[PDB]
């Protein structure tokens with residue numbers, strides 16, 4: 553139930569995205585999860601819908617979230633909306649590109 557379990561859900565979703573929901577998008581996301589030994593970098597592209605480790609040469613958006621914060625969402629226990637207000641996720645670059653994504657996250661549980 554670590555960062556691996558959190559991303560495991562994304563990598564599966566990104567490669568499972570349906571043309572009925574979203575649409576041909578473009579850009580990149582830089583997810584940063586806090587840790588006891590530092591922070592884990594991640595690159596989430598929207599052009600081809602994929603995910604990678606580390607940091608991109610220059611992401612269009614930079615997301616900053618803590619471990620507990622992520623586990624809360626991916627754990628289906630909490631919603632991005634709540635954490636959003638609390639200030640769990642930081643916005644760097646284009647709050648739109650990031651906010652738009654959360655839209656797909658804020659939904660019914662069990663997923």
Ligand SMILES: CCCCCCCCCCCCCCCC(=O)O
Pocket residue numbers: 562565566569574575577581582583584596597598599601615653656
């Ligand atoms: C940096 C934010 C944390 C990780 C983001 C989880 C990504 C979930 C799946 C991405 C695709 C969902 C949006 C559909 C349109 C698209 O982006 O192609």
Ligand SMILES: CCCCCCCCCCCCCCCC(=O)O
Pocket residue numbers: 558559561562565615617622625626632641642643650651652653654656657663
């Ligand atoms: C600023 C808006 C961006 C919203 C990003 C939500 C915080 C990071 C991603 C949350 C956990 C995502 C892991 C599972 C995939 C999903 O269901 O979204």
